[PDB]
Each structure stands twice: as C-alpha cells, then as structure tokens.
C-alpha cells in the first residue's frame, strides 16, 4: 500500500505541482491569450473607424 | 430646417441608452477580469480541481479505448473470417 | 440648414458608438466565453455509472476480441496446414 | 491494494500533463492568431491607409 502511495507521493510532490504550476501559467496564458486576441480585435476596432470613410 | 431637429432629438436618445450600456460593458470587462483572476488565485492556492480533471479525462479515454478495440475487432474479425472463408475449403475437399 | 451636417455627424457618432458598443459587447461576450470555458475546471454517480458502464463495454469488447477473435491463433495454424493442398 | 490499483491503473492507461500539452500548443495558436490579426492588421491598414 505504501508503494502505491509512493508512486502517488512522487506524482503528488514532484509532478502534479509542476504540471499544476505550468498549467496555471499556461491557463493564465490561454485566458490572457484569448484576451491578447481581444487586443487584436481592438486593432480591428481601429480599422473599423478607418473603414467608415472607406 | 425643422425636421432635422426632430431627427437630432431622436439621435441623441442613444447616445444616452448606449452610453449607459457602454458603462455597463466597461464594468463587465472588469467583472470578467474579476472572475478570471480570481481563478488565477484559486490556481495559486489549491490543487486546480485535479479530481474532476482526471475523471473527465478518463471519460473520453474510455470512449477512445473503445474505438481502438473496435478497430482491433473489425481487423481480427475479418482477418479470421476471410481465412476461414478460404481456408475451410482451400482444397475444397481434398 | 447646417443641421443636416449636425445630424449626419450625430448619427455617425451613434453608429460609431454602436460599433464600439458591439465591440465591447463582444469584449464582454468573448470574456464571458473566456471565463465560461474556465468554469469547466473551476455528479460522482454518473462518473461511476459510466465510467463503470464504459469499463464494462470494454470488458465485453475484450471478450468480443476472444470471439471476434483469438481464433486467428488456430486459424493461422490452419493457414499453415490448410495450404498443404499445395 | 487492489482497490487502489484498479483505479490507479486508469492513469497508467489514461492526465494534467495532457492538459498541459494542449496548453503548450494552444497558446502558440493564439499567438499565431494574434499575430495574424495584429501584424496582419498592420498589413490591412498599411493598405487601407494608402488607399484612403
């Protein structure tokens, strides 16, 4: 039971938290990357004004 | 030129409606940012809901494990079907 | 007289405002969508009632594999001896 | 020991790491998309500017 726990110990102490922090930062990036997309949408909003005259 | 004033009166009606909505939306942008980070902190504080992750993850894996074995079945089923199709009668009777 | 120019610009201000509103409508609706897809991470009964039923279909498939088939073990042996017509 | 292996084997044959690999793809897809709507926007308006 201990070894099954040890495999889990390894996972939980060294893998899950790194994967979790990596996930965290990478989700911050996909949150924030969707938001960066929203920044290019703002670039489109600028375009949208130029196109009024167009 | 008379009718223009009426149109101007109408024009400025929203204007008012819209700006009220724009204020709302500006706040909503903040609120969404205010829902999201937030989650950033939740991710900084706890074990990112790993249990649900593994359970949802597994749901699809099982559905895919099924597709893989179904593939294996169509393969074996036909490899064997065709071997029997020929082989039981390869000499026909000899 | 010049009221036409007032109005033209005024309507343009409105429509520009609408475009901007729609822009933000979407910043918000997109940001909604951005959070809504995160709410996904942040009923055990079904999880056990499929997983276990998906788990069971697989166990069944493992046995379908025995009939559909493991017979190739024998049938390949037949593939070796049946061509003894040659 | 058995109840635990029955469930732990699930991971062995399929987790967080996969979500992470997806993220490792996804952000560069979003980065490609941002570029292609940022630098490409610059192209759209270098052309629109010249044209206007």
Automatic annotation (TrEMBL), chain A:
It comes from the Eukaryota. It comes from Tetrahymena thermophila (strain SB210). This is Centrosomal protein, putative. It is found in: Cytoplasm, Cytoskeleton, Microtubule organizing center, Centrosome, Centriole. Belongs to the CEP135/TSGA10 family.
Automatic annotation (TrEMBL), chain B:
Belongs to the CEP135/TSGA10 family. Signal peptide: none annotated. It comes from the Eukaryota. This is Centrosomal protein, putative. It is found in: Cytoplasm, Cytoskeleton, Microtubule organizing center, Centrosome, Centriole. The chain holds residues 233 to 326 of 380 of the full protein. Residues 1-21 form a coiled coil.
TrEMBL record, chain C:
This is Centrosomal protein, putative. Belongs to the CEP135/TSGA10 family. It is found in: Cytoplasm, Cytoskeleton, Microtubule organizing center, Centrosome, Centriole. Signal peptide: none annotated. The lineage of its organism: Eukaryota, Sar, Alveolata, Ciliophora, Intramacronucleata.
């Amino acid at each position: 039971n201990q070894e099954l726990e040890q495999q889990l110990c390894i996972i939980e102490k060294s893998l899950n938290p790194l994967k979790a922090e990596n996930q965290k930062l990478m989700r911050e990036n996909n949150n924030l990357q969707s938001e960066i997309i929203l920044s290019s949408e703002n670039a489109q909003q600028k375009y949208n004004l130029l196109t009024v005259r167009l | 030129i008379k009718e223009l004033q009426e149109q101007l009166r109408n024009c400025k009606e929203q204007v008012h409606t819209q700006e009220a909505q724009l204020s709302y939306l500006k706040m909503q942008v903040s609120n969404r940012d205010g829902e999201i980070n937030r989650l950033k902190t939740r991710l900084d504080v706890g074990g990112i809901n790993m249990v649900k992750l593994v359970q949802d993850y597994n749901y699809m894996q099982q559905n895919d494990k099924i597709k893989l074995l179904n593939h294996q079945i169509d393969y074996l089923n036909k490899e064997n079907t065709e071997m029997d199709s020929i082989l039981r009668s390869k000499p026909y009777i000899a």
